[PDB]
Each structure stands twice: as C-alpha cells, then as structure tokens.
Design an enzyme around this catalytic site. Structure first.
Site, PDB file in Angstrom:
ATOM      1  N   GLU A 108       0.700  -1.123   0.080  1.00 48.31           N
ATOM      2  CA  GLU A 108       0.028   0.061  -0.008  1.00 48.31           C
ATOM      3  C   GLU A 108       1.027   1.274  -0.086  1.00 48.31           C
ATOM      4  OE1 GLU A 108      -3.221   0.362  -0.446  1.00 48.31           O
ATOM      5  OE2 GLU A 108      -3.036   2.538  -0.002  1.00 48.31           O
ATOM      6  N   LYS A 160       2.515   1.820  -3.180  1.00 50.40           N
ATOM      7  CA  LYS A 160       1.299   2.462  -4.507  1.00 50.40           C
ATOM      8  C   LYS A 160       1.426   3.730  -4.509  1.00 50.40           C
ATOM      9  CE  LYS A 160      -1.854  -0.589  -3.854  1.00 50.40           C
ATOM     10  NZ  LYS A 160      -3.154  -1.495  -3.782  1.00 50.40           N
ATOM     11  N   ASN A 161       1.241   4.142  -3.117  1.00 48.66           N
ATOM     12  CA  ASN A 161       0.987   5.799  -2.850  1.00 48.66           C
ATOM     13  C   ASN A 161       2.371   6.534  -3.256  1.00 48.66           C
ATOM     14  OD1 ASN A 161      -1.587   5.231  -2.010  1.00 48.66           O
ATOM     15  ND2 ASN A 161      -0.750   4.847   0.217  1.00 48.66           N
TER      16      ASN A 161
HETATM   17  O1  LIG Z   1       2.288  12.699  -0.887  1.00 46.05           O
HETATM   18  C1  LIG Z   1       1.735  11.746  -1.102  1.00 46.05           C
HETATM   19  C2  LIG Z   1       1.706  10.411  -0.361  1.00 46.05           C
HETATM   20  C3  LIG Z   1       0.526   9.778   0.523  1.00 46.05           C
HETATM   21  C4  LIG Z   1       0.913   8.485   1.037  1.00 46.05           C
HETATM   22  C5  LIG Z   1       1.975   7.761   1.082  1.00 46.05           C
HETATM   23  O2  LIG Z   1       2.142   6.758   1.691  1.00 46.05           O
HETATM   24  C6  LIG Z   1       3.010   8.490  -0.007  1.00 46.05           C
HETATM   25  C7  LIG Z   1       2.879   9.669  -0.460  1.00 46.05           C
HETATM   26  O3  LIG Z   1       3.868  10.088  -1.388  1.00 46.05           O
HETATM   27  N1  LIG Z   1       0.783  12.021  -2.371  1.00 46.05           N
HETATM   28  C8  LIG Z   1       0.843  12.807  -3.197  1.00 46.05           C
HETATM   29  C9  LIG Z   1       0.025  12.416  -4.512  1.00 46.05           C
HETATM   30  C10 LIG Z   1      -0.103  13.095  -5.662  1.00 46.05           C
HETATM   31  C11 LIG Z   1      -0.663  12.238  -6.723  1.00 46.05           C
HETATM   32  C12 LIG Z   1      -0.787  10.834  -6.573  1.00 46.05           C
HETATM   33  C13 LIG Z   1      -1.109  10.350  -5.314  1.00 46.05           C
HETATM   34  C14 LIG Z   1      -0.274  11.193  -4.306  1.00 46.05           C
HETATM   35  C15 LIG Z   1       0.083  10.707  -2.810  1.00 46.05           C
END
Ligand SMILES: O=C(c1ccc(O)cc1O)N1Cc2ccccc2C1
Ligand SMILES: O=C(c1ccc(O)cc1O)N1Cc2ccccc2C1
Lengths: 363, 363
Positions: free
Chosen positions: A236, A239-240
């Site tokens: 998970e 993926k993020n």
């Molecule tokens: O900063 C995060 C983030 C959140 C949770 C995480 O575990 C890791 C991460 O980098 N995201 C910005 C962004 C922009 C576009 C698409 C998806 C995401 C997710």
C-alpha cells in the site's frame, strides 16, 4: 436446537478478549494434544471476540445500522457465532469433533471474505440515503477502526488453527515466520507495486534500501512476524509513493527513487519509506486515514495491521517536496501482543456523543 | 470601586474569544484613530480571553487547584482582569486613558512573566502532596495545552499594542515580520544552540540547510510571521537534535550534521530538522510532549506556538538511527488565524471523566 443468537451474544460479550503475544502463537505445537487445546481455546475465544464486536455494532447510529450492507455483515457474524455454538457440548477427544471444527472455521473464513468492501458499501448507503453528518462520521471512524482490527484478530486465530492443523514454508508456524527477513519483504512489495506502476505509467521509481542494525551493524535484519501483514502494509505504501512520484513528475524522464530505511533498535523495528512525490498539505493528511473520505481503505487498514501487534503506521509530508511513511513494529516477539478492542463502559461511553460547538474557537 | 472578580468572570466568560488572522494583525496601523480602536477592542477582548481561561482553571481537580502555585497564578489573572475593568468607563478620546492603558498592559505582562514555571511548580506540588493519578494527569495535560495557548494569545495581543503604540526593525508591525526570511531564523537558532552545545560538549554538529520553493525554485523563502515564535521552536528543536547527536556519538570525532529542509508549498511552509542522534523508541515519544513526565516544557510549548497560527510540530523517530522533527506553518497570512480555546459545554464535558477500564484489551 441452538438458543437464539442474542442469548449467546449477551453471554459471551461479558468476557474480555484474551490477547496473545507473537511469542505465544509461535510456541504453539502441532500435536493432537495441541489440537485439542486449540479447539478448547477457540470454542470460547472466538465466541468472545465475535460477541464483543457484535455488541458494538449495535451502538452505531440507527442510520448506519439500518443499511442493508451493515445488516448483511451482522447476519454473517450471527451465523458464524451459531456455527461455533454447535461445538459447545462436543468432545475434544473425538477426532471427528476436531476435523469438523476445522471445517467450520474454514466456512466462517469464507463467509466473511468480503466483509471489508461490504461494510464500505454500508457507509456509502448511509451517505446516499441520509446524507452524512459529523457526529455519525466520528462514530463510524471510531467503530470501523475497532471493527476491522477485531476482524484481523479473528482471522489470525482462524488462520493459525487451519494452517497448523491442516506447504511452501514448513519453517513457518501457521502464518508466522520466526525469521522474517524484512528487506526481502520490502523487495517483494516493491516488485508487485512496480508491476502496477509500470502498467499505467510505463515507468516507476527505482528502490534503494538501507539497513541500520544498531546493535549488530553487519547483521541482516530479521524478526518474528506475519509476512503477509508486512507485505500488505508495504505494498500500500509503495503504491502511494509511486503514484505520487510519477504524477508529480509528468515532464521528467528521470524519477527520484523511493528510499527505504529499515532500522533495528532495542525496542523498535522501524521501516521508513521516503519519496519525492511532491507531498500533501497537512490539512489533507487526516483524510488519508478516513473511511468517509476514502468512500480505498488501503491506508487505514494498513495502519490497523501495524497497530495489531502494538506498532503503528504514520505519515509525515512536506508539501512541495515529498512524503515519509513509517511503519513502527515491535522488535521483540514478547512485546508483540495482540491489540484487541473490548466492549465495555469505556467503549460504550465513547459512542455517546452529540452535536455541539467544539472547545476551540472559529472566527 | 470595582465589583468582585467573580461577577466580571461570569460576565466575560459568556463571550467567545475572537480569533484574528495574521493578515488582520498586520493591517493594523499606528495612528491615534487606530490606537483608540485598539483600546476599545482590547478592553473587551482581553477580559473575554482572561475570563474564559479562568473559568477552565476552576474545572481542574480539587487536588491541583488546592496547590499554592496554581492559586498564585489564579490570583495574577484576577488582578489583571480587575486592572482592565478600571478602563470600562474611560473615554478613548482622552489621551491619558490611552497612555494609562498601555501602562496597565505592561504591568500585566510583567506580572505574568513567570506563569509557565509557576504552573509547573503547581504540577509538582500536586504530585508531591497527593501522588499523581492518571485521571488527574489527563485533565492536567488537556488543561495546560489550552492554558498555555491562551496565554500565548494574550501575550500576542499585549505585545502588538505596546510595540505599535509605544526600534531594531521599523519594518516589523509590532512583533510581526511581513518578510521573515525563514532560513535566517533557522541560522540564528542554530547559532545560539551551538553556543550551548559547544559549552557542554566542546563540539557540535554542523548545519546544512536546503530550500525547496515549489512554485519558484530560485526564490529564497519568506513568510509573514512572528520571528521570535519561530526562533523559539527552532532553538528547542536544535537543542534536542544536538544533544542526541553528541550523546549518541561519545566515541566519534566526526559528528553527523543536522539537516534542515525548508519547503514552501501552496498551503504549507514546512521545516524539517533531521538528525542522526540514535533516536527514541516510539513508546517514549508521547512523553516528550507530556507536562507530567517533563516535570522542561520546551517541546510542548514549542508545539503550542506552532498550533497558535494553525500549524503543528510533529516528531518522528527511528530508534537506532535518529529523529525527524517537522514544524508545519501556514504559508499564507490569510490562513494564519489564531487558534484559541473557548470555555463552553464541549470544553466542560471534556473534563468530566473518571477512573475505569479502557476500551482496549490488556492481557
Ligand atoms: O504525498 C503523497 C503520499 C501519500 C501517502 C503515501 O504513503 C505516500 C505519498 O507520497 N501523495 C501525493 C500524491 C499526488 C498524486 C497521486 C498520489 C499522491 C500521494
Ligand atoms: O531522538 C532524540 C530527539 C528528540 C527530540 C528531538 O527534537 C530531536 C531528537 O533527536 N533524542 C535522543 C536523545 C539521546 C540523548 C539525549 C537527548 C536525546 C533526544
């Protein structure tokens, strides 16, 4: 031939679940003597855990309880409880009792397979039917954390029994690896996340892993853990991190890598995943763990897996730069004790809230 | 010639404090017209803020309220409230009213100078006299966060008035710098922390600063802020990071640097301080923000400064490796709005707790 379910629910809900340590799970053997012990333990403990959470379901807002999907999940729990009640008067000395019991546990696991998305449909039904309100929303958040953690614990008990008493890794004790190599699980999760990222974006960030074994700097880091849970959390998180990295770099051919640090201290085994995916403003961090805004339970359920053995999963972003995610685990099997919600006055009281102005000022 | 204090406390506690934005503070001028406005505003707002927090003091456990140091602080608040009541019927058109008012605000600020350590002595008196208990401890924690944040806000109002209407930086508006260069404040705090670290350890980690200005990569990062507050938070963080670094490297001549990143996003201005000082297990993180265990309020008060304009200060460690601390600030003056505790049913209810088994299981 069974009593009505409410009689059993009231009876078993009076008991507290009994948390086991990873050490205790691990020290459990595979003999008939052990199988009988597992049987006599689980025919009390599983009803206790089922009843405790069923009692809390009933504390949900009428609006949420009235939804067909929540009613459906409730009905599964009722039938699973009754399935186990059929074993109350059975003789453990009889091998047929034991084989029938394992069969019933498998049937229960299968029945409950789709609990997570079914409850999510319940939350959607509540929002669609009534519109959401902040009081109900807070109750749902509190409840679902506890409901899903309870479910993780019931699945753990069932998997341990069916795996041990009915094979890729003969060194595992049920689902537990006494020598889980953390970096190998990190790599496995990265590989699977990369497949998905490559499919949609035709590119993915590279991986860099660094280990810090504080007390033994040369030694690869291992722990006693359930690899599938660790994999789930890391997958998970990757993926993020991957999605953020690619989406924040639309113009680039060069993607910053995802950096993972695995640190082993005296008490913690900590895994940090750092990306340069542009981050998220602090205001939006809480929503990542919300069942309501996510109604996509990847992150909140991942955090429950971490909390289940007394760990945690925390996110800290820097808007404009990137995000760090940290999985905190207990380094020692003796500290790794199930975290189980219990139905009591404290829990009951926590539900008893109402609409009103908060204790902080708004302009 | 004044009414008894309780009559005033009851009257003013019915109102909610009125939070101001950094933008509003900044847009306030230095004319007699403005001074009269400041006067008429503060002779209502300061009593409102004083009364609101005094009402909450009375919700503390009898044990805590019974301590001489808490009683002493209460008596200061009473006198400061009464000092302002003397101005209720005074004419703002009269210059003597205005000059007398500024004098009274200075007297109040001086009277309350030692509030923080005096309250800490109260907490110590409670522990010594009665022994501590977890219910009282939770109440104290909740109260002190609110009490100290309230105090920060009252000091802000007073400083703005006395600074503007009675000089190193003529570009500042009272205590506010409309063009605060964040990295310069980081360097100032580092320099002062280094003096202390060098004194005790004869060595200190170097500093590295990196800026990420997301929207304007060339531009040095500035914001509207109260530099003294930012300095306070950074100085506390450097002291901790330096101490950790030196103490975890007793054998080394080479110390890992403290790395600071200043990131400017659309909504947040975030400052991360990263050290390799060996870290702290997760279990012990909460205690760093505890008034009880710290009874050394450096970190919890620093976090209140961050929260005061809708920011936060968060710590994430990796035991065996080091610690990251992040100050989150609002990037925009319009989002930087005072966070003020308010005495209401919600706050009152939050106190109303008692001893009982929690909603989670223990073995
Ligand atoms: O900063 C995060 C983030 C959140 C949770 C995480 O575990 C890791 C991460 O980098 N995201 C910005 C962004 C922009 C576009 C698409 C998806 C995401 C997710
Ligand atoms: O990890 C930290 C820490 C806490 C808070 C913080 O802001 C920065 C930090 O590095 N410390 C470990 C340690 C060991 C010895 C002495 C002091 C300290 C403080």
């Amino acid at each position: 031939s069974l009593a009505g379910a409410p009689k059993y629910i009231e009876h078993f809900s009076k008991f507290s679940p009994s948390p086991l340590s990873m050490k205790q799970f691990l020290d459990f053997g595979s003999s008939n003597a052990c199988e009988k012990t597992s049987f006599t333990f689980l025919r009390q403990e599983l009803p206790v855990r089922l009843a405790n959470i069923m009692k809390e379901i009933n504390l949900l807002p009428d609006r949420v309880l009235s939804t067909p999907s929540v009613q459906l999940v409730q009905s599964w729990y009722v039938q699973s409880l009754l399935d186990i009640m059929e074993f109350l008067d059975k003789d453990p000395e009889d091998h047929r009792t034991l084989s029938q019991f394992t069969d019933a546990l498998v049937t229960i696991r299968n029945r409950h397979n789709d609990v997570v998305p079914t409850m999510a449909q319940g939350v959607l039904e509540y929002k669609d039917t009534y519109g959401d309100d902040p009081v109900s929303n807070q109750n749902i958040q509190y409840f679902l954390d506890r409901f899903y953690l309870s479910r993780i614990s019931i699945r753990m008990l069932i998997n341990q029994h069916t795996l041990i008493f009915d094979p890729a890794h003969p060194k595992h004790i049920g689902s537990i690896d006494p020598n889980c190599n953390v970096s190998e699980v990190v790599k496995d999760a990265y590989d699977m996340a990369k497949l998905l990222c490559d499919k949609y974006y035709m590119a993915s960030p590279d991986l860099e892993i660094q280990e810090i074994n504080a007390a033994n700097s040369k030694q690869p880091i291992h722990m006693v853990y359930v690899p599938s849970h660790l994999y789930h959390m890391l997958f998970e998180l990757f993926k993020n991190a991957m999605r953020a990295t690619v989406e924040s770099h639309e113009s680039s051919l060069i993607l910053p890598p995802i950096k993972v640090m695995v640190a082993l201290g005296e008490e913690d085994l900590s895994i940090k995943m750092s990306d340069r995916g542009g981050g998220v403003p602090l205001r939006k961090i809480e929503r990542l763990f919300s069942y309501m805004y996510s109604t996509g339970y990847g992150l909140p359920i991942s955090r429950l897996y971490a909390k289940y053995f007394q760990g945690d999963l925390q996110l800290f972003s820097m808007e404009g730069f990137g995000t760090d995610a940290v999985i905190y685990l207990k380094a020692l099997s003796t500290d790794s004790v199930e975290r189980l919600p219990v139905y009591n006055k404290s829990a009951w009281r926590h539900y008893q809230t109402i609409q009103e102005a908060g204790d902080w000022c708004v302009p």
